[PDB]
Amino acid sequence: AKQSMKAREVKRVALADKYFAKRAELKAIISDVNAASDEDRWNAVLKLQTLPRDSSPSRQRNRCRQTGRPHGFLRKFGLSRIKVREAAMRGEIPGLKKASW
Amino acid sequence: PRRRVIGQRKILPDPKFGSELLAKFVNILMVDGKKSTAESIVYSALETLAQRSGKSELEAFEVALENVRPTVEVKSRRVGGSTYQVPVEVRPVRRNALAMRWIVEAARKRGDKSMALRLANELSDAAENKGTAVKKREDVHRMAEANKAFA
Amino acid sequence: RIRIRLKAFDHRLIDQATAEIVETAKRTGAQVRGPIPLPTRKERFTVLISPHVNKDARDQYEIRTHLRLVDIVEPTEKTVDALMRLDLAAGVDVQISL
Amino acid sequence: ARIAGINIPDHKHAVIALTSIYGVGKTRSKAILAAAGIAEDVKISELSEGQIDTLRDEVAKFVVEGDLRREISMSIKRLMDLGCYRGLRHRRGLPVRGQRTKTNARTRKGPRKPI
Amino acid sequence: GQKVHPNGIRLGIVKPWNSTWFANTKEFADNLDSDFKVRQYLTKELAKASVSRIVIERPAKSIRVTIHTARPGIVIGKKGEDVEKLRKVVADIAGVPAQINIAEVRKPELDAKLVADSITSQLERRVMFRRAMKRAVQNAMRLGAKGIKVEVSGRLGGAEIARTEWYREGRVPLHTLRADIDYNTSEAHTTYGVIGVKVWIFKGEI
Amino acid sequence: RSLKKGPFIDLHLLKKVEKAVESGDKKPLRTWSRRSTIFPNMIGLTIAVHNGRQHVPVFVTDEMVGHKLGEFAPTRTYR
Amino acid sequence: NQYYGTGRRKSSAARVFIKPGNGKIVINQRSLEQYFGRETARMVVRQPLELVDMVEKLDLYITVKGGGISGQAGAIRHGITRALMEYDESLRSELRKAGFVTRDARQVERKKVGLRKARRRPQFSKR
RNA sequence: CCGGCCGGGAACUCAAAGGAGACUGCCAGUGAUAAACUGGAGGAAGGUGGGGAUGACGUCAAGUCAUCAUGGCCCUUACGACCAGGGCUACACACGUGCUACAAUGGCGCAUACAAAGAGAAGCGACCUCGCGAGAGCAAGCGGACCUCAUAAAGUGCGUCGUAGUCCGGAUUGGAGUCUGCAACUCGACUCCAUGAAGUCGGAAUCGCUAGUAAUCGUGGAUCAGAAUGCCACGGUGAAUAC
RNA sequence: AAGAACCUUACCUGGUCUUGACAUCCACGGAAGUUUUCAGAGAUGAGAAUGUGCCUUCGGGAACCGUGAGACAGGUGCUGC
Ligand SMILES: [Mg+2]
Ligand SMILES: [Mg+2]
Ligand SMILES: [Mg+2]
Ligand SMILES: [Mg+2]
Ligand SMILES: [Mg+2]
Ligand SMILES: [Mg+2]
Ligand SMILES: [Mg+2]
Ligand SMILES: [Mg+2]
Ligand SMILES: [Mg+2]
Ligand SMILES: [Mg+2]
Ligand SMILES: [Mg+2]
Ligand SMILES: [Mg+2]
Ligand SMILES: [Mg+2]
Ligand SMILES: [Mg+2]
Ligand SMILES: [Mg+2]
Ligand SMILES: [Mg+2]
Ligand SMILES: [Mg+2]
Ligand SMILES: [Mg+2]
Ligand SMILES: [Mg+2]
Ligand SMILES: [Mg+2]
Ligand SMILES: [Mg+2]
Ligand SMILES: [Mg+2]
Ligand SMILES: [Mg+2]
Ligand SMILES: [Mg+2]
Ligand SMILES: [Mg+2]
Ligand SMILES: [Mg+2]
Ligand SMILES: [Mg+2]
Ligand SMILES: [Mg+2]
Ligand SMILES: [Mg+2]
Ligand SMILES: [Mg+2]
Ligand SMILES: [Mg+2]
Ligand SMILES: [Mg+2]
Ligand SMILES: [Mg+2]
Ligand SMILES: [Mg+2]
Ligand SMILES: [Mg+2]
Ligand SMILES: [Mg+2]
Ligand SMILES: [Mg+2]
Ligand SMILES: [Mg+2]
Ligand SMILES: [Mg+2]
Ligand SMILES: [Mg+2]
Ligand SMILES: [Mg+2]
Ligand SMILES: [Mg+2]
Ligand SMILES: [Mg+2]
Ligand SMILES: [Mg+2]
Ligand SMILES: [Mg+2]
Ligand SMILES: [Mg+2]
Ligand SMILES: [Mg+2]
Ligand SMILES: [Mg+2]
Ligand SMILES: [Mg+2]
Ligand SMILES: [Mg+2]
Ligand SMILES: [Mg+2]
Ligand SMILES: [Mg+2]
Ligand SMILES: [Mg+2]
Ligand SMILES: [Mg+2]
Ligand SMILES: [Mg+2]
Ligand SMILES: [Mg+2]
Ligand SMILES: [Mg+2]
Ligand SMILES: [Mg+2]
Ligand SMILES: [Mg+2]
Ligand SMILES: [Mg+2]
Ligand SMILES: [Mg+2]
Ligand SMILES: [Mg+2]
Ligand SMILES: [Mg+2]
Ligand SMILES: [Mg+2]
Ligand SMILES: [Mg+2]
Ligand SMILES: [Mg+2]
Ligand SMILES: [Mg+2]
Ligand SMILES: [Mg+2]
Ligand SMILES: [Mg+2]
Ligand SMILES: [Mg+2]
Ligand SMILES: [Mg+2]
Ligand SMILES: [Mg+2]
Ligand SMILES: [Mg+2]
Ligand SMILES: [Mg+2]
Ligand SMILES: [Mg+2]
Ligand SMILES: [Mg+2]
Ligand SMILES: [Mg+2]
Ligand SMILES: [Mg+2]
Ligand SMILES: [Mg+2]
Ligand SMILES: [Mg+2]
Ligand SMILES: [Mg+2]
Ligand SMILES: [Mg+2]
Ligand SMILES: [Mg+2]
Ligand SMILES: [Mg+2]
Ligand SMILES: [Mg+2]
Ligand SMILES: [Mg+2]
């Protein structure tokens, strides 16, 4: 699913773990109902855009690891709906037999 | 079913008037599976009927249901080619059930106030045969009587 | 006391794992209640079976996570050390808790 | 039964009587009768004139009828003069709150037309 | 296309899971990716060594890989030198330690992957698809098979329109769930295109 | 509408406006930030908002304050 | 002394104890009159106590959880018929012929894949 | 102190495993001395007991080259590649599939009873306190039969409206907000307030459904920062009819 | 499509890059990194400080970073006849 689209996603993962998995203090702690509500809260949201557009974990689409398909994802397996099926009935996901109740 | 001759399910008696005839009537009146709302209306109707009529409930419901009961109904078979009116003697299980539908179907219309009022007034008119349900039986006879030429 | 809880995917791999952990504890240094079962977690997944269109057609999968408890009611010196460094049983997760 | 601009109902509960006033609904009407000290179960025929005069001063607090109609008319007319996205939406006769305009929108767009 | 994967329907009943490990919901996805990374790598590296399936286990941060194979000599090489070369490179991408074990298979013609890869290899060297298919069907019935359905889909023999052809000899009950059936597929990348090679091998009734 | 924690403008547009206002009136500012709100200090400026293919000049008035810049720049043309 | 019968009509699971004494019917510490109100049938629990008469013979301490009204009320009916085993096969000859001891398995059907709810298919477009 | 709270208890519900069990197996009758079958016992269950998975050879050169793989044929200071916005949400119209209606078996208020199946660690987030409410703080506990989202709603029980475009519908608009999120105007969801459109059961047509099924009332999950009336599951009350 | 505000996004506008965002090499210079400032819509470009490690053939290393060079990398472009 486009090697550029797969390769631009590695920036999104690597660069997010750098900034906002550490510098969420800029938005969370500072922008709060307390004594910093005056210019300190203004300088927070001002400085929050100085950061790159990426880094925000909302910008991560969360696509399949094998193929790179954006849609049809499953968080348990980290795979697309097609590749989980191909892998399940084959012997790769442990315990994942066909359900029938 | 094409060749699957199986019987029907058993029903249950209504606590306050433990029988069968009016137990079916609750079921035909019931909308959206709400037997709690429907069964309260039938008791409210038959109590208001028994007050006015000066009878019990089962015999009050009977002298009413028989007055809207079809003797013969009209089918139409094409045996040979053409389509014509063939009357047939209705079966005893369907006979009284087809009557209970015509009482309730009439009571959908005739917007008095409440459902308990409307069924009471329909069964009251059925006792003195001058409602809508008796007219629907009357018309059903007129077809069988007029189209009696076809066996 | 030590509440030992252990879970797995196969229903008939965990049985000998629960049998051997109890026997290497009951026999070596006494005391055991038994294999307390607990409810099974059945995480279901309903994926689309085709690669394009055909929404009606799907396959349904599940993963039975079978739990088990052990529950000993005395901190025995022979038993407590037999739990550590002496488990094995692959495909069966185990979590000892004091 | 003559408060505010209009309000002339009869054989209707006091809470439902004041819904007919433009600028007063269900919950506002409960706040009127709570402040006035009148029961919601009574009706205007049952009430006396001594109690109706207290309702007149209570609804005078809130913006109602011709005061409200102009406040809404000002706000819509303001948007159209600015030439904003909502102003273009209003004067063109199309739905405003980011709605679907392709299949539906019949309330705002009006009934069906020929092609 | 409307048939269930014969291995998959029997994963609880008769056939086993190849990846046999427990993991909590957090690690599960990353643990399954590293499982695919070694499997993809180890299959392509050990091509001539002739691997059927790869079983993987993970008891308490220790990845025990098992390579079921027809030719165990080519996997190990000389004095188990290639085992140590595999041990190192597999351990890096996967997760800390390694424990590669090699299971021999004295009846290689009854394993579905090895028959499919043999037919694939033959199709790539300009051998007739019938002479590759029927000979493989004939070879394993004499040894110890009771089924052996073999389908070959695609262009085959440089044709314009693609055809699907199959030749079986015996009982191959795909519907029977108690029945053990080795099923496997392989693609044959020729000059004309891709040629699929599905193989079913009914061994035992239970 | 959203955002109680300070009305939002992009750093670049804030600094560009502050630099433009202190100097004096000049020309339409090429800005792509539609998302940004309009401050009281922006009144008088004829900033050019990006509709998508071109820049639409918008003379900011007393009323155009709480509204955002993209409201005065129709994207999809019709008839 | 104190006999027992299970009953578990439709998810719900009754737990009927029965002793020889007063005519009362206790259930979850509530009275039978107030626990089961106007709904459809209170006396489905008392249906099995008709061919074998109660009146003032057998007191019933009941406990139930699961289902709703009729699921519980029907589970108590099955629970009582199972519980009435103190005169083994003499009662069950007359009791079985009027239904009663039949579990009546019928549970809610699962939602099918593709279909809108169990049997209800969506619609049909033929152009 | 009066709540499974308490020691404790191992009966029962349940939870799991491993077994019993329904076998036309018994019983008569129709049959051809057969396969069968009509009922009848016994039984929790009766003739594949209900439901699921399971999909033969092959049909439609059916769908997918945009999941992936892939033979050719094509592009390479571009059909490749990074960024800010805009767009996929456009709107004389036409249909599909829904949902909410058009009410009185109903609508709004107060007294309060009964589920299942899930799900949760940058998670799900009590009780408290601030909120008219979305929510805002503090933060308890739980990788869970325990802790949490979580009061199920239908349903009763009282009240009140009394057939009105209505106390039906709840659209649409204006204002005031809330959380998420760098950012909510194009283009979110929800809340409050006022607003109160069409609609009074639908032309030719036409759809699904054979019992816990239709019908109706909740509820969950997957994808998911946020964003279901969809989808996938779950359980309540519970019909008619099959000559 | 198991959920389009940016992302996704394959489309459009304008800005932009050509061994490229993603890869192994032949080899030139540097630890990797981290903090922080300026012009710009942002991609980017310009800096300013600090740190200067696991083995010595010590003209080297095993990674990482940024140059020039080509084998090339890359295409959700067409063809499900
Ligand atoms: Mg690719
Ligand atoms: Mg997203
Ligand atoms: Mg389909
Ligand atoms: Mg369809
Ligand atoms: Mg309102
Ligand atoms: Mg309100
Ligand atoms: Mg809306
Ligand atoms: Mg729109
Ligand atoms: Mg094919
Ligand atoms: Mg199938
Ligand atoms: Mg134009
Ligand atoms: Mg059960
Ligand atoms: Mg019997
Ligand atoms: Mg089905
Ligand atoms: Mg249902
Ligand atoms: Mg269709
Ligand atoms: Mg049609
Ligand atoms: Mg049609
Ligand atoms: Mg047609
Ligand atoms: Mg026989
Ligand atoms: Mg036989
Ligand atoms: Mg016999
Ligand atoms: Mg004979
Ligand atoms: Mg005979
Ligand atoms: Mg014989
Ligand atoms: Mg015989
Ligand atoms: Mg026989
Ligand atoms: Mg029988
Ligand atoms: Mg029978
Ligand atoms: Mg049989
Ligand atoms: Mg059978
Ligand atoms: Mg079956
Ligand atoms: Mg059978
Ligand atoms: Mg069976
Ligand atoms: Mg079968
Ligand atoms: Mg075609
Ligand atoms: Mg077609
Ligand atoms: Mg098709
Ligand atoms: Mg492709
Ligand atoms: Mg090519
Ligand atoms: Mg060529
Ligand atoms: Mg050429
Ligand atoms: Mg071109
Ligand atoms: Mg679309
Ligand atoms: Mg929308
Ligand atoms: Mg025109
Ligand atoms: Mg239409
Ligand atoms: Mg209302
Ligand atoms: Mg309603
Ligand atoms: Mg759970
Ligand atoms: Mg709580
Ligand atoms: Mg509270
Ligand atoms: Mg409120
Ligand atoms: Mg806040
Ligand atoms: Mg909180
Ligand atoms: Mg705990
Ligand atoms: Mg506790
Ligand atoms: Mg919830
Ligand atoms: Mg609680
Ligand atoms: Mg709550
Ligand atoms: Mg509570
Ligand atoms: Mg109610
Ligand atoms: Mg009006
Ligand atoms: Mg009208
Ligand atoms: Mg509204
Ligand atoms: Mg109105
Ligand atoms: Mg009306
Ligand atoms: Mg209709
Ligand atoms: Mg209706
Ligand atoms: Mg039709
Ligand atoms: Mg039909
Ligand atoms: Mg059927
Ligand atoms: Mg409703
Ligand atoms: Mg709701
Ligand atoms: Mg739901
Ligand atoms: Mg969730
Ligand atoms: Mg829903
Ligand atoms: Mg719904
Ligand atoms: Mg973009
Ligand atoms: Mg361009
Ligand atoms: Mg290429
Ligand atoms: Mg390509
Ligand atoms: Mg193109
Ligand atoms: Mg085709
Ligand atoms: Mg094909
Ligand atoms: Mg096509």
From Swiss-Prot, chain C:
Question: In the UniProt record, does the keyword Transmembrane helix occur?
Answer: no
**Molecular function via GO:** structural constituent of ribosome; transcription antitermination factor activity, RNA binding; tRNA binding
Matching entries from InterPro entries are given as: Ribosomal_uS10, Ribosomal_uS10_CS, Ribosomal_uS10_dom, Ribosomal_uS10_dom_sf
User: Could you name the Gene Ontology cellular component terms for this entry?
Assistant: cytoplasm; cytosol; cytosolic small ribosomal subunit; small ribosomal subunit; transcription elongation factor complex
Where does the source fall among the domains of life? Bacteria
The Gene Ontology biological process terms listed for this entry are: cytoplasmic translation; regulation of DNA-templated transcription elongation; ribosome biogenesis; transcription antitermination
Q: Which keywords appear in this protein's UniProt record, sorted alphabetically?
A: Ribonucleoprotein, Ribosomal protein, Ribosome biogenesis, RNA-binding, Transcription, Transcription antitermination, Transcription regulation
UniProt-listed Pfam families: Ribosomal_S10
Keyword field contains Ribosomal protein: yes
Summarizing the function annotation, the protein's role is: Involved in the binding of tRNA to the ribosomes. Part of the processive rRNA transcription and antitermination complex (rrnTAC). The complex forms an RNA-chaperone ring around the RNA exit tunnel of RNA polymerase (RNAP). It supports rapid transcription and antitermination of rRNA operons, cotranscriptional rRNA folding, and annealing of distal rRNA regions to allow correct ribosome biogenesis. In complex with NusB is involved in the regulation of ribosomal RNA (rRNA) biosynthesis by transcriptional antitermination.
Family classification: Belongs to the universal ribosomal protein uS10 family.
Q: Which NCBIfam families match?
A: PRK00596.1, rpsJ_bact
Protein's UniProt name:
Small ribosomal subunit protein uS10
Swiss-Prot record, chain D:
**A GO term for molecular function:** tRNA binding
Checking InterPro entries in the record gives:
Rbsml_uS13_C, Ribosomal_uS13, Ribosomal_uS13-like_H2TH, Ribosomal_uS13_bac-type, Ribosomal_uS13_CS
Keywords on record:
Ribonucleoprotein, Ribosomal protein, RNA-binding, rRNA-binding, tRNA-binding
Enumerate the SUPFAM superfamilies for this protein.
S13-like H2TH domain (SSF46946)
What's one Pfam family the UniProt record gives for this protein?
Ribosomal_S13
An example GO CC term for this entry is: cytosol
What processes in GO biological process is this protein linked to?
cytoplasmic translation
Q: Which residues lie within the region annotated Disordered?
A: 93-115
Q: Which residues cross the membrane?
A: none
- Keyword Transmembrane helix found: no
What's its job? Located at the top of the head of the 30S subunit, it contacts several helices of the 16S rRNA. In the E.coli 70S ribosome in the initiation state was modeled to contact the 23S rRNA (bridge B1a) and protein L5 of the 50S subunit (bridge B1b), connecting the 2 subunits; bridge B1a is broken in the model with bound EF-G, while the protein-protein contacts between S13 and L5 in B1b change. The 23S rRNA contact site in bridge B1a is modeled to differ in different ribosomal states, contacting alternately S13 or S19. In the two 3.5 angstroms resolved ribosome structures the contacts between L5, S13 and S19 bridge B1b are different, confirming the dynamic nature of this interaction.
Q: Which PANTHER family does the record cross-reference, listed alphabetically?
A: 30S RIBOSOMAL PROTEIN S13/40S RIBOSOMAL PROTEIN S18, SMALL RIBOSOMAL SUBUNIT PROTEIN US13M
Similarity-based family:
Belongs to the universal ribosomal protein uS13 family.
Report what the protein is called: Small ribosomal subunit protein uS13
Q: Which organism is it from?
A: Escherichia coli (strain K12)
Curated annotation (Swiss-Prot), chain F:
Q: Does the keyword Thylakoid apply?
A: no
- Sorted alphabetically, which Gene3D superfamilies does this protein's record hold? 30s Ribosomal Protein S19, Chain A
Naming one, the record's GO cellular component terms include: cytoplasm
Keywords, ordered alphabetically: Ribonucleoprotein, Ribosomal protein, RNA-binding, rRNA-binding, tRNA-binding
Name a single GO biological process.
ribosomal small subunit assembly
GO molecular function: any one?
A: rRNA binding
Keyword field contains Acetylation: no
Q: Where is the signal peptide?
A: none
Question: Superkingdom of this entry's organism?
Answer: Bacteria
What is its quaternary makeup? Part of the 30S ribosomal subunit. Binds S13 and L5 and cross-links to the A site tRNA.
So what family is this one in?
Answer: Belongs to the universal ribosomal protein uS19 family.
User: What is the documented function of this protein?
Assistant: In the E.coli 70S ribosome in the initiation state it has been modeled to contact the 23S rRNA of the 50S subunit forming part of bridge B1a; this bridge is broken in the model with bound EF-G. The 23S rRNA contact site in bridge B1a is modeled to differ in different ribosomal states, contacting alternately S13 or S19. In the 3.5 angstroms resolved ribosome structures the contacts between L5, S13 and S19 bridge B1b are different, confirming the dynamic nature of this interaction. Bridge B1a is not visible in the crystallized ribosomes due to 23S rRNA disorder. Protein S19 forms a complex with S13 that binds strongly to the 16S ribosomal RNA. Contacts the A site tRNA.
Per its record, how is this protein called by name? Answer: Small ribosomal subunit protein uS19
What species was this sequence derived from? Escherichia coli (strain K12)
What's the gene?
Answer: rpsS
Curated annotation (Swiss-Prot), chain G:
The reply on keyword Ribosomal protein is: yes
Name the InterPro entries on file.
Answer: Ribosomal_Su5_D2-typ_SF, Ribosomal_uS9, Ribosomal_uS9_bac/plastid, Ribosomal_uS9_CS, Ribsml_uS5_D2-typ_fold_subgr
Task: Extract the coiled-coil ranges from the record.
Answer: none
Q: Does the keyword tRNA-binding apply?
A: yes
Gene Ontology BP annotations: cytoplasmic translation
What molecular functions are annotated in GO for this chain?
RNA binding; structural constituent of ribosome; tRNA binding
Might you report a single GO cellular component term?
cytoplasm
Q: SUPFAM superfamilies given for it? A: Ribosomal protein S5 domain 2-like
Q: Which UniProt keywords apply?
A: Ribonucleoprotein, Ribosomal protein, RNA-binding, tRNA-binding
Q: Name one Pfam family in it.
A: Ribosomal_S9
Its quaternary organisation is:
Part of the 30S ribosomal subunit. Contacts 16S rRNA. Cross-links to the P site tRNA and weakly to the A site tRNA.
**PANTHER family annotated for this entry?**
RIBOSOMAL PROTEIN S9, SMALL RIBOSOMAL SUBUNIT PROTEIN US9M
Matching entries from NCBIfam families are given as: PRK00132.1 (NF001099)
Q: Please give the function described in this protein's UniProt entry.
A: The C-terminal tail plays a role in the affinity of the 30S P site for different tRNAs. Mutations that decrease this affinity are suppressed in the 70S ribosome.
Family of the protein in this entry: Belongs to the universal ribosomal protein uS9 family.
Know the name of this protein? Small ribosomal subunit protein uS9
